[PDB]
Symmetry: C3
Subunit: 31 residues, 3 copies
C-alpha cells in the first residue's frame, strides 16, 4: 500500500506543478 | 495513518483531474 | 516513508485548494 501511495503522490506532484504553471500563465496573461 | 493517506490521495486525485479538465478548457477556449 | 508521504500530501492539499480558488475565479470571471 505504501509504495502504491508513493507512486500516486509523485504522479500528483507532477500534475499539480503542471497545473500551477498553466494557471500562473492564465492569471498573468503570459503569451 | 496509511488508510488516512489513501483517502486523501484518492480525494486529491479526483480534485486534480477536475482541475486539469477546467484548465484544459480555459487554455483551449472551449465553449 | 509514511511521514514523508504525510508531509507531501498535506503540501499537495494546500496547493490543490489554492488552484481550485484561482480556477474558480477564472471560470467565474471574478474581479
Amino acid at each position: 500500500e505504501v509504495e502504491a501511495l508513493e507512486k500516486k503522490v509523485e504522479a500528483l506532484e507532477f500534475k499539480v506543478q503542471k497545473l500551477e504553471k498553466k494557471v500562473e500563465a492564465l492569471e498573468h496573461g503570459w503569451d
